[PDB]
Amino acid sequence: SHMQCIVNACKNSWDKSYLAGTPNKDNCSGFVQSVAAELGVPMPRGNANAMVDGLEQSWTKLASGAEAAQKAAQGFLVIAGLKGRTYGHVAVVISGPLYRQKYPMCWCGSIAGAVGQSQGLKSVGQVWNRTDRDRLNYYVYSLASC
Amino acid sequence: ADCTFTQLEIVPQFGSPNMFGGEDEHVRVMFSNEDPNDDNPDAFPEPPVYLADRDSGNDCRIEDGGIWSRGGVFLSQDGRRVLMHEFSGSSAELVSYDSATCKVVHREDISGQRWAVDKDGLRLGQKCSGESVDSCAKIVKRSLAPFCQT
């Protein structure tokens, strides 16, 4: 079978509004909630910070961005996540070449603007800044999706 | 004491490859584009940002910060300040730099807010249809005084 379940879910989720009245492109947590719902992967409720709190308490953490990309290539849902002061950020890690030989490709919505949005063409190291991208947590679900 | 900021267009530069910048009478700003497969970036995650103070002649580097929005660079009318939109994930801040030294003058966390800067000042919006501040149910004026430090 194909191993494009994660990417298909991201594409299908982009134009949805997980939260009533809020396009997923503008809401990182909503985008991730829509992706997980399509894949039927249980996800902590709440905003990005609350989601990271939940993932930290339950999901296995990967050692590196490189490992995150490999797991995504193997059909696992991998969430890159980092709390903010109020506005945290979550992104879906996908298969692809590592930016600066470290940072995996991703999809994400962002209230910061189009610059923070990725439809798979930006790495986590091009959505989070030079300091934050080295503080990322990579949470992987216990089961693969394809 | 409320100085006026004007948008600086940031465009591909001649010469050294992958450089994007712009200038007015007082200051030139340059960025490097290090995204190997995107020749038209909308942002610059890698320092340094190069500032040239045309009047004094000094060149300096902003060695840290970002990610710098390509469309989010503004110059004060007197050339003494460079105001820059910087973001990370879903967070964002506006940062003012001294054009002569590259030192930070002021930061303001604007995470969660839509925003615009123009002749008339800084606007911050809430309950918005989209990215433009004009899509917002409420738009508040925010003082630029600490950014100007006129």
PDB file of C-alpha atoms in Angstrom:
ATOM      1  CA  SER A   1       0.000   0.000   0.000  1.00  0.00           C
ATOM      2  CA  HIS A   2       1.113   3.601  -0.436  1.00  0.00           C
ATOM      3  CA  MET A   3       2.789   5.380   2.463  1.00  0.00           C
ATOM      4  CA  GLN A   4       1.148   8.739   1.862  1.00  0.00           C
ATOM      5  CA  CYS A   5      -1.494   8.657   4.606  1.00  0.00           C
ATOM      6  CA  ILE A   6       0.112  11.507   6.575  1.00  0.00           C
ATOM      7  CA  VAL A   7       0.534  13.819   3.561  1.00  0.00           C
ATOM      8  CA  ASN A   8      -2.976  13.078   2.257  1.00  0.00           C
ATOM      9  CA  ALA A   9      -4.386  13.901   5.689  1.00  0.00           C
ATOM     10  CA  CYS A  10      -2.457  17.190   5.774  1.00  0.00           C
ATOM     11  CA  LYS A  11      -3.680  18.186   2.312  1.00  0.00           C
ATOM     12  CA  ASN A  12      -7.271  17.283   3.139  1.00  0.00           C
ATOM     13  CA  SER A  13      -7.074  19.185   6.429  1.00  0.00           C
ATOM     14  CA  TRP A  14      -5.607  22.435   5.147  1.00  0.00           C
ATOM     15  CA  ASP A  15      -8.866  24.072   4.023  1.00  0.00           C
ATOM     16  CA  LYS A  16     -10.957  22.872   6.970  1.00  0.00           C
ATOM     17  CA  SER A  17     -11.827  24.788  10.125  1.00  0.00           C
ATOM     18  CA  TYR A  18     -11.490  22.461  13.093  1.00  0.00           C
ATOM     19  CA  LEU A  19     -12.617  25.349  15.285  1.00  0.00           C
ATOM     20  CA  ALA A  20     -15.881  26.933  14.153  1.00  0.00           C
ATOM     21  CA  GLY A  21     -15.075  30.122  12.273  1.00  0.00           C
ATOM     22  CA  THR A  22     -11.314  29.686  12.310  1.00  0.00           C
ATOM     23  CA  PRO A  23      -9.564  28.446   9.153  1.00  0.00           C
ATOM     24  CA  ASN A  24      -6.939  25.810   9.902  1.00  0.00           C
ATOM     25  CA  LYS A  25      -4.315  27.788   7.978  1.00  0.00           C
ATOM     26  CA  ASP A  26      -4.551  30.384  10.750  1.00  0.00           C
ATOM     27  CA  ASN A  27      -4.602  27.967  13.693  1.00  0.00           C
ATOM     28  CA  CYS A  28      -1.781  25.507  14.229  1.00  0.00           C
ATOM     29  CA  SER A  29      -3.644  23.463  16.836  1.00  0.00           C
ATOM     30  CA  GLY A  30      -6.750  23.240  14.645  1.00  0.00           C
ATOM     31  CA  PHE A  31      -4.777  22.022  11.674  1.00  0.00           C
ATOM     32  CA  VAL A  32      -3.172  19.260  13.757  1.00  0.00           C
ATOM     33  CA  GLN A  33      -6.562  18.357  15.260  1.00  0.00           C
ATOM     34  CA  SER A  34      -8.037  17.929  11.758  1.00  0.00           C
ATOM     35  CA  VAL A  35      -5.129  15.782  10.605  1.00  0.00           C
ATOM     36  CA  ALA A  36      -5.392  13.528  13.651  1.00  0.00           C
ATOM     37  CA  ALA A  37      -9.167  13.244  13.264  1.00  0.00           C
ATOM     38  CA  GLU A  38      -8.828  12.081   9.671  1.00  0.00           C
ATOM     39  CA  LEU A  39      -6.235   9.492  10.726  1.00  0.00           C
ATOM     40  CA  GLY A  40      -8.325   8.568  13.772  1.00  0.00           C
ATOM     41  CA  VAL A  41      -5.406   9.256  16.075  1.00  0.00           C
ATOM     42  CA  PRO A  42      -6.493  10.434  19.557  1.00  0.00           C
ATOM     43  CA  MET A  43      -5.205  13.933  20.319  1.00  0.00           C
ATOM     44  CA  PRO A  44      -5.196  16.033  23.501  1.00  0.00           C
ATOM     45  CA  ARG A  45      -7.847  18.763  23.446  1.00  0.00           C
ATOM     46  CA  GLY A  46      -7.187  22.473  23.688  1.00  0.00           C
ATOM     47  CA  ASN A  47      -4.877  25.123  22.284  1.00  0.00           C
ATOM     48  CA  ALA A  48      -1.313  24.516  21.170  1.00  0.00           C
ATOM     49  CA  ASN A  49       0.127  24.819  24.689  1.00  0.00           C
ATOM     50  CA  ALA A  50      -2.488  22.431  26.093  1.00  0.00           C
ATOM     51  CA  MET A  51      -1.825  19.982  23.260  1.00  0.00           C
ATOM     52  CA  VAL A  52       1.928  20.003  23.944  1.00  0.00           C
ATOM     53  CA  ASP A  53       1.235  19.500  27.665  1.00  0.00           C
ATOM     54  CA  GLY A  54      -0.873  16.473  26.735  1.00  0.00           C
ATOM     55  CA  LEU A  55       1.609  15.009  24.267  1.00  0.00           C
ATOM     56  CA  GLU A  56       4.424  15.471  26.786  1.00  0.00           C
ATOM     57  CA  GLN A  57       2.414  13.441  29.328  1.00  0.00           C
ATOM     58  CA  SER A  58       1.531  10.562  26.960  1.00  0.00           C
ATOM     59  CA  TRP A  59       3.459  10.246  23.667  1.00  0.00           C
ATOM     60  CA  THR A  60       6.943   8.836  23.067  1.00  0.00           C
ATOM     61  CA  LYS A  61       9.520  11.483  22.229  1.00  0.00           C
ATOM     62  CA  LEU A  62      12.036  11.011  19.426  1.00  0.00           C
ATOM     63  CA  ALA A  63      15.688  11.938  19.881  1.00  0.00           C
ATOM     64  CA  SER A  64      16.101  14.013  16.728  1.00  0.00           C
ATOM     65  CA  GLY A  65      14.454  15.813  13.844  1.00  0.00           C
ATOM     66  CA  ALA A  66      16.146  13.239  11.602  1.00  0.00           C
ATOM     67  CA  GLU A  67      14.345  10.441  13.428  1.00  0.00           C
ATOM     68  CA  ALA A  68      11.067  12.362  13.175  1.00  0.00           C
ATOM     69  CA  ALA A  69      11.348  12.424   9.400  1.00  0.00           C
ATOM     70  CA  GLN A  70      12.143   8.714   9.272  1.00  0.00           C
ATOM     71  CA  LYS A  71       9.112   7.899  11.404  1.00  0.00           C
ATOM     72  CA  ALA A  72       6.908  10.038   9.171  1.00  0.00           C
ATOM     73  CA  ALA A  73       8.331   8.154   6.156  1.00  0.00           C
ATOM     74  CA  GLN A  74       7.212   4.967   7.898  1.00  0.00           C
ATOM     75  CA  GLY A  75       3.621   6.194   8.189  1.00  0.00           C
ATOM     76  CA  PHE A  76       3.643   7.500  11.774  1.00  0.00           C
ATOM     77  CA  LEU A  77       2.006  10.742  12.860  1.00  0.00           C
ATOM     78  CA  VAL A  78       4.796  12.904  14.306  1.00  0.00           C
ATOM     79  CA  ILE A  79       4.001  16.239  15.929  1.00  0.00           C
ATOM     80  CA  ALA A  80       6.789  18.776  16.347  1.00  0.00           C
ATOM     81  CA  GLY A  81       5.797  20.906  19.323  1.00  0.00           C
ATOM     82  CA  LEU A  82       7.018  23.739  21.508  1.00  0.00           C
ATOM     83  CA  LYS A  83       5.074  25.740  24.070  1.00  0.00           C
ATOM     84  CA  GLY A  84       4.906  29.504  23.839  1.00  0.00           C
ATOM     85  CA  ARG A  85       4.359  32.124  26.520  1.00  0.00           C
ATOM     86  CA  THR A  86       0.678  32.047  25.475  1.00  0.00           C
ATOM     87  CA  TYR A  87       0.712  30.903  21.830  1.00  0.00           C
ATOM     88  CA  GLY A  88       2.487  27.600  21.356  1.00  0.00           C
ATOM     89  CA  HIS A  89       3.075  25.885  18.045  1.00  0.00           C
ATOM     90  CA  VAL A  90       2.503  22.388  16.711  1.00  0.00           C
ATOM     91  CA  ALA A  91       3.346  21.050  13.238  1.00  0.00           C
ATOM     92  CA  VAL A  92       3.015  17.730  11.423  1.00  0.00           C
ATOM     93  CA  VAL A  93       6.420  16.331  10.444  1.00  0.00           C
ATOM     94  CA  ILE A  94       6.611  14.739   7.000  1.00  0.00           C
ATOM     95  CA  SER A  95       9.171  12.782   4.983  1.00  0.00           C
ATOM     96  CA  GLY A  96      11.673  14.907   3.106  1.00  0.00           C
ATOM     97  CA  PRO A  97      15.227  16.274   2.991  1.00  0.00           C
ATOM     98  CA  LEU A  98      16.470  17.921   6.208  1.00  0.00           C
ATOM     99  CA  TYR A  99      16.992  21.656   6.173  1.00  0.00           C
ATOM    100  CA  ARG A 100      20.573  22.389   7.300  1.00  0.00           C
ATOM    101  CA  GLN A 101      20.979  18.596   7.674  1.00  0.00           C
ATOM    102  CA  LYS A 102      18.912  18.727  10.866  1.00  0.00           C
ATOM    103  CA  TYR A 103      15.350  20.054  10.504  1.00  0.00           C
ATOM    104  CA  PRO A 104      12.560  17.968   8.970  1.00  0.00           C
ATOM    105  CA  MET A 105       9.908  19.176   6.516  1.00  0.00           C
ATOM    106  CA  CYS A 106       6.454  19.885   7.960  1.00  0.00           C
ATOM    107  CA  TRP A 107       2.893  21.118   7.514  1.00  0.00           C
ATOM    108  CA  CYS A 108       1.390  23.710   9.830  1.00  0.00           C
ATOM    109  CA  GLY A 109      -1.085  26.524  10.155  1.00  0.00           C
ATOM    110  CA  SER A 110      -0.003  29.686  11.957  1.00  0.00           C
ATOM    111  CA  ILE A 111      -1.703  32.720  13.412  1.00  0.00           C
ATOM    112  CA  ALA A 112       1.624  34.556  12.823  1.00  0.00           C
ATOM    113  CA  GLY A 113       0.689  34.860   9.143  1.00  0.00           C
ATOM    114  CA  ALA A 114       1.467  33.237   5.795  1.00  0.00           C
ATOM    115  CA  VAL A 115       5.142  33.323   6.759  1.00  0.00           C
ATOM    116  CA  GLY A 116       4.504  30.765   9.512  1.00  0.00           C
ATOM    117  CA  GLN A 117       2.341  28.509   7.378  1.00  0.00           C
ATOM    118  CA  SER A 118       3.760  25.457   5.671  1.00  0.00           C
ATOM    119  CA  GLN A 119       2.007  23.327   3.073  1.00  0.00           C
ATOM    120  CA  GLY A 120       4.957  20.933   3.186  1.00  0.00           C
ATOM    121  CA  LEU A 121       7.487  23.285   1.608  1.00  0.00           C
ATOM    122  CA  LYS A 122       9.039  24.643   4.807  1.00  0.00           C
ATOM    123  CA  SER A 123      11.011  22.717   7.444  1.00  0.00           C
ATOM    124  CA  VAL A 124      10.419  23.162  11.160  1.00  0.00           C
ATOM    125  CA  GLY A 125      13.677  25.186  11.110  1.00  0.00           C
ATOM    126  CA  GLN A 126      12.042  27.670   8.717  1.00  0.00           C
ATOM    127  CA  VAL A 127       8.840  28.078  10.778  1.00  0.00           C
ATOM    128  CA  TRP A 128      10.493  28.316  14.208  1.00  0.00           C
ATOM    129  CA  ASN A 129      13.455  30.678  14.659  1.00  0.00           C
ATOM    130  CA  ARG A 130      17.144  29.824  15.091  1.00  0.00           C
ATOM    131  CA  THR A 131      16.878  29.410  18.876  1.00  0.00           C
ATOM    132  CA  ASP A 132      13.459  27.737  19.100  1.00  0.00           C
ATOM    133  CA  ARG A 133      14.087  25.187  16.355  1.00  0.00           C
ATOM    134  CA  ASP A 134      16.795  23.619  18.570  1.00  0.00           C
ATOM    135  CA  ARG A 135      14.315  23.318  21.468  1.00  0.00           C
ATOM    136  CA  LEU A 136      11.708  21.317  19.570  1.00  0.00           C
ATOM    137  CA  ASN A 137      10.076  18.201  20.924  1.00  0.00           C
ATOM    138  CA  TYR A 138       9.150  15.470  18.441  1.00  0.00           C
ATOM    139  CA  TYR A 139       6.217  13.385  19.621  1.00  0.00           C
ATOM    140  CA  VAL A 140       5.382  10.170  17.774  1.00  0.00           C
ATOM    141  CA  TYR A 141       2.150   8.206  18.080  1.00  0.00           C
ATOM    142  CA  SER A 142       2.413   4.640  19.366  1.00  0.00           C
ATOM    143  CA  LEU A 143       0.880   3.210  16.180  1.00  0.00           C
ATOM    144  CA  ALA A 144       1.506   3.957  12.505  1.00  0.00           C
ATOM    145  CA  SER A 145      -1.322   5.261  10.304  1.00  0.00           C
ATOM    146  CA  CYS A 146      -0.321   3.357   7.142  1.00  0.00           C
TER     147      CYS A 146
ATOM    148  CA  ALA B   1       7.957  62.202  19.627  1.00  0.00           C
ATOM    149  CA  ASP B   2       6.092  59.665  17.492  1.00  0.00           C
ATOM    150  CA  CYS B   3       8.410  58.959  14.561  1.00  0.00           C
ATOM    151  CA  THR B   4       7.032  57.678  11.253  1.00  0.00           C
ATOM    152  CA  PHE B   5       7.986  54.303   9.764  1.00  0.00           C
ATOM    153  CA  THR B   6       7.860  53.468   6.066  1.00  0.00           C
ATOM    154  CA  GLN B   7       7.913  49.989   4.538  1.00  0.00           C
ATOM    155  CA  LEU B   8      11.177  48.947   2.906  1.00  0.00           C
ATOM    156  CA  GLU B   9      10.735  46.652  -0.082  1.00  0.00           C
ATOM    157  CA  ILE B  10      13.131  43.710   0.097  1.00  0.00           C
ATOM    158  CA  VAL B  11      14.173  42.419  -3.339  1.00  0.00           C
ATOM    159  CA  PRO B  12      16.807  40.242  -5.059  1.00  0.00           C
ATOM    160  CA  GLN B  13      20.143  42.042  -5.163  1.00  0.00           C
ATOM    161  CA  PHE B  14      22.751  42.103  -7.930  1.00  0.00           C
ATOM    162  CA  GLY B  15      26.151  40.559  -7.191  1.00  0.00           C
ATOM    163  CA  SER B  16      26.723  38.100  -4.346  1.00  0.00           C
ATOM    164  CA  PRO B  17      24.176  35.311  -4.850  1.00  0.00           C
ATOM    165  CA  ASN B  18      21.009  34.701  -2.829  1.00  0.00           C
ATOM    166  CA  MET B  19      20.990  38.168  -1.264  1.00  0.00           C
ATOM    167  CA  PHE B  20      17.815  40.153  -0.729  1.00  0.00           C
ATOM    168  CA  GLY B  21      17.662  43.744   0.400  1.00  0.00           C
ATOM    169  CA  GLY B  22      16.603  47.318  -0.077  1.00  0.00           C
ATOM    170  CA  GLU B  23      17.688  50.820   0.761  1.00  0.00           C
ATOM    171  CA  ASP B  24      16.536  54.367   1.187  1.00  0.00           C
ATOM    172  CA  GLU B  25      18.501  57.574   1.646  1.00  0.00           C
ATOM    173  CA  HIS B  26      19.671  56.583   5.125  1.00  0.00           C
ATOM    174  CA  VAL B  27      19.960  52.810   5.408  1.00  0.00           C
ATOM    175  CA  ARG B  28      20.472  49.635   3.400  1.00  0.00           C
ATOM    176  CA  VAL B  29      19.209  46.311   4.796  1.00  0.00           C
ATOM    177  CA  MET B  30      20.409  42.934   3.430  1.00  0.00           C
ATOM    178  CA  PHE B  31      19.453  39.307   4.097  1.00  0.00           C
ATOM    179  CA  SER B  32      20.846  36.002   2.853  1.00  0.00           C
ATOM    180  CA  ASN B  33      18.486  33.390   1.441  1.00  0.00           C
ATOM    181  CA  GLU B  34      19.711  29.961   2.513  1.00  0.00           C
ATOM    182  CA  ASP B  35      16.682  27.922   1.452  1.00  0.00           C
ATOM    183  CA  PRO B  36      18.332  25.728  -1.215  1.00  0.00           C
ATOM    184  CA  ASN B  37      15.153  25.286  -3.281  1.00  0.00           C
ATOM    185  CA  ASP B  38      13.106  28.481  -2.963  1.00  0.00           C
ATOM    186  CA  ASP B  39      14.273  31.502  -4.963  1.00  0.00           C
ATOM    187  CA  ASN B  40      11.392  33.703  -3.810  1.00  0.00           C
ATOM    188  CA  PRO B  41      11.301  33.390  -0.017  1.00  0.00           C
ATOM    189  CA  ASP B  42       8.847  35.281   2.142  1.00  0.00           C
ATOM    190  CA  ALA B  43      11.151  35.214   5.175  1.00  0.00           C
ATOM    191  CA  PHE B  44      14.722  34.878   6.423  1.00  0.00           C
ATOM    192  CA  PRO B  45      15.476  32.514   9.320  1.00  0.00           C
ATOM    193  CA  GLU B  46      19.262  32.821   9.233  1.00  0.00           C
ATOM    194  CA  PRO B  47      21.214  35.744  10.644  1.00  0.00           C
ATOM    195  CA  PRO B  48      23.100  37.948  10.106  1.00  0.00           C
ATOM    196  CA  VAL B  49      21.033  40.838   8.881  1.00  0.00           C
ATOM    197  CA  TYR B  50      23.348  43.453   7.434  1.00  0.00           C
ATOM    198  CA  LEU B  51      22.644  47.158   8.080  1.00  0.00           C
ATOM    199  CA  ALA B  52      24.514  49.945   6.319  1.00  0.00           C
ATOM    200  CA  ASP B  53      24.214  53.409   7.810  1.00  0.00           C
ATOM    201  CA  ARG B  54      24.754  55.501   4.698  1.00  0.00           C
ATOM    202  CA  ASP B  55      25.261  58.761   6.593  1.00  0.00           C
ATOM    203  CA  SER B  56      27.875  57.617   9.106  1.00  0.00           C
ATOM    204  CA  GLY B  57      29.270  54.919   6.819  1.00  0.00           C
ATOM    205  CA  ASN B  58      29.176  52.219   9.492  1.00  0.00           C
ATOM    206  CA  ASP B  59      28.205  48.668   8.537  1.00  0.00           C
ATOM    207  CA  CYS B  60      26.932  46.380  11.287  1.00  0.00           C
ATOM    208  CA  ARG B  61      25.388  42.916  11.637  1.00  0.00           C
ATOM    209  CA  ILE B  62      22.343  41.853  13.619  1.00  0.00           C
ATOM    210  CA  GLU B  63      23.772  38.483  14.724  1.00  0.00           C
ATOM    211  CA  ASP B  64      20.663  36.918  16.277  1.00  0.00           C
ATOM    212  CA  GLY B  65      16.881  36.977  16.127  1.00  0.00           C
ATOM    213  CA  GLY B  66      14.313  36.198  13.439  1.00  0.00           C
ATOM    214  CA  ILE B  67      12.617  34.732  11.716  1.00  0.00           C
ATOM    215  CA  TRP B  68      12.547  37.994   9.712  1.00  0.00           C
ATOM    216  CA  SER B  69       9.461  38.537   7.537  1.00  0.00           C
ATOM    217  CA  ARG B  70      10.492  39.751   4.076  1.00  0.00           C
ATOM    218  CA  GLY B  71       7.551  42.130   3.963  1.00  0.00           C
ATOM    219  CA  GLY B  72       8.011  43.325   7.550  1.00  0.00           C
ATOM    220  CA  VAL B  73      10.935  45.734   7.442  1.00  0.00           C
ATOM    221  CA  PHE B  74      10.336  49.468   8.037  1.00  0.00           C
ATOM    222  CA  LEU B  75      12.617  52.496   8.314  1.00  0.00           C
ATOM    223  CA  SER B  76      12.117  55.537  10.527  1.00  0.00           C
ATOM    224  CA  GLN B  77      11.997  58.810   8.632  1.00  0.00           C
ATOM    225  CA  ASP B  78      15.290  59.966  10.196  1.00  0.00           C
ATOM    226  CA  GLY B  79      16.993  56.658   9.384  1.00  0.00           C
ATOM    227  CA  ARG B  80      18.018  56.042  12.998  1.00  0.00           C
ATOM    228  CA  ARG B  81      15.715  53.053  13.527  1.00  0.00           C
ATOM    229  CA  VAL B  82      14.908  49.835  11.675  1.00  0.00           C
ATOM    230  CA  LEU B  83      11.635  48.180  12.772  1.00  0.00           C
ATOM    231  CA  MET B  84      11.346  44.480  11.936  1.00  0.00           C
ATOM    232  CA  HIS B  85       8.651  41.849  12.212  1.00  0.00           C
ATOM    233  CA  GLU B  86      10.081  38.623  13.607  1.00  0.00           C
ATOM    234  CA  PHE B  87       8.235  35.374  14.237  1.00  0.00           C
ATOM    235  CA  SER B  88       8.645  31.866  15.553  1.00  0.00           C
ATOM    236  CA  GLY B  89       5.996  29.171  15.195  1.00  0.00           C
ATOM    237  CA  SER B  90       2.808  30.953  16.180  1.00  0.00           C
ATOM    238  CA  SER B  91       4.561  33.712  18.161  1.00  0.00           C
ATOM    239  CA  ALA B  92       5.639  37.102  16.816  1.00  0.00           C
ATOM    240  CA  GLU B  93       7.283  40.308  17.959  1.00  0.00           C
ATOM    241  CA  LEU B  94       8.174  43.722  16.585  1.00  0.00           C
ATOM    242  CA  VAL B  95      11.770  44.736  17.183  1.00  0.00           C
ATOM    243  CA  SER B  96      13.397  48.114  16.706  1.00  0.00           C
ATOM    244  CA  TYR B  97      17.146  48.372  15.986  1.00  0.00           C
ATOM    245  CA  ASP B  98      19.583  51.303  16.072  1.00  0.00           C
ATOM    246  CA  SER B  99      20.756  51.590  12.464  1.00  0.00           C
ATOM    247  CA  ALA B 100      24.176  52.856  13.551  1.00  0.00           C
ATOM    248  CA  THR B 101      25.029  49.992  15.915  1.00  0.00           C
ATOM    249  CA  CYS B 102      22.563  47.136  15.241  1.00  0.00           C
ATOM    250  CA  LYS B 103      21.621  47.095  18.941  1.00  0.00           C
ATOM    251  CA  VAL B 104      18.071  46.367  20.001  1.00  0.00           C
ATOM    252  CA  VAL B 105      16.172  49.467  21.110  1.00  0.00           C
ATOM    253  CA  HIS B 106      12.793  47.883  21.932  1.00  0.00           C
ATOM    254  CA  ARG B 107      10.772  44.668  21.589  1.00  0.00           C
ATOM    255  CA  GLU B 108       7.039  44.126  21.786  1.00  0.00           C
ATOM    256  CA  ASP B 109       5.381  40.711  21.894  1.00  0.00           C
ATOM    257  CA  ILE B 110       2.436  40.766  19.483  1.00  0.00           C
ATOM    258  CA  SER B 111       1.679  37.036  19.484  1.00  0.00           C
ATOM    259  CA  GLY B 112      -1.889  36.227  18.493  1.00  0.00           C
ATOM    260  CA  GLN B 113      -2.532  39.671  16.980  1.00  0.00           C
ATOM    261  CA  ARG B 114      -2.900  40.770  13.382  1.00  0.00           C
ATOM    262  CA  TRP B 115      -0.824  43.869  12.735  1.00  0.00           C
ATOM    263  CA  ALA B 116       0.105  46.629  10.296  1.00  0.00           C
ATOM    264  CA  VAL B 117       2.589  49.486  10.253  1.00  0.00           C
ATOM    265  CA  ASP B 118       2.310  52.530   7.983  1.00  0.00           C
ATOM    266  CA  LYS B 119       2.463  56.360   7.838  1.00  0.00           C
ATOM    267  CA  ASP B 120      -0.232  56.485  10.507  1.00  0.00           C
ATOM    268  CA  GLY B 121       1.408  54.151  13.002  1.00  0.00           C
ATOM    269  CA  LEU B 122       1.007  50.647  14.393  1.00  0.00           C
ATOM    270  CA  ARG B 123      -2.324  48.822  14.465  1.00  0.00           C
ATOM    271  CA  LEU B 124      -3.111  45.541  16.293  1.00  0.00           C
ATOM    272  CA  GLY B 125      -6.239  43.519  15.557  1.00  0.00           C
ATOM    273  CA  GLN B 126      -8.377  40.893  17.229  1.00  0.00           C
ATOM    274  CA  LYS B 127     -11.283  38.720  16.016  1.00  0.00           C
ATOM    275  CA  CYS B 128     -10.064  38.657  12.417  1.00  0.00           C
ATOM    276  CA  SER B 129     -11.291  36.867   9.281  1.00  0.00           C
ATOM    277  CA  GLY B 130      -7.742  36.612   7.981  1.00  0.00           C
ATOM    278  CA  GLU B 131      -4.188  37.913   8.158  1.00  0.00           C
ATOM    279  CA  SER B 132      -4.862  41.544   7.239  1.00  0.00           C
ATOM    280  CA  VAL B 133      -5.579  43.764  10.205  1.00  0.00           C
ATOM    281  CA  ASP B 134      -8.575  45.191   8.269  1.00  0.00           C
ATOM    282  CA  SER B 135     -10.269  41.790   8.586  1.00  0.00           C
ATOM    283  CA  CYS B 136     -10.496  42.326  12.336  1.00  0.00           C
ATOM    284  CA  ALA B 137     -13.566  43.150  14.415  1.00  0.00           C
ATOM    285  CA  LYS B 138     -11.442  45.338  16.646  1.00  0.00           C
ATOM    286  CA  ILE B 139      -8.280  47.245  15.745  1.00  0.00           C
ATOM    287  CA  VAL B 140      -6.302  49.118  18.382  1.00  0.00           C
ATOM    288  CA  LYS B 141      -3.655  51.783  17.856  1.00  0.00           C
ATOM    289  CA  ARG B 142      -0.372  50.927  19.567  1.00  0.00           C
ATOM    290  CA  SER B 143       2.219  53.599  20.409  1.00  0.00           C
ATOM    291  CA  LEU B 144       5.455  53.459  18.432  1.00  0.00           C
ATOM    292  CA  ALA B 145       7.247  55.796  20.850  1.00  0.00           C
ATOM    293  CA  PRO B 146       9.476  53.192  22.518  1.00  0.00           C
ATOM    294  CA  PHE B 147      10.465  51.937  19.050  1.00  0.00           C
ATOM    295  CA  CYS B 148      11.413  55.402  17.829  1.00  0.00           C
ATOM    296  CA  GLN B 149      13.258  56.522  20.946  1.00  0.00           C
ATOM    297  CA  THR B 150      13.323  59.825  19.071  1.00  0.00           C
TER     298      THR B 150
END
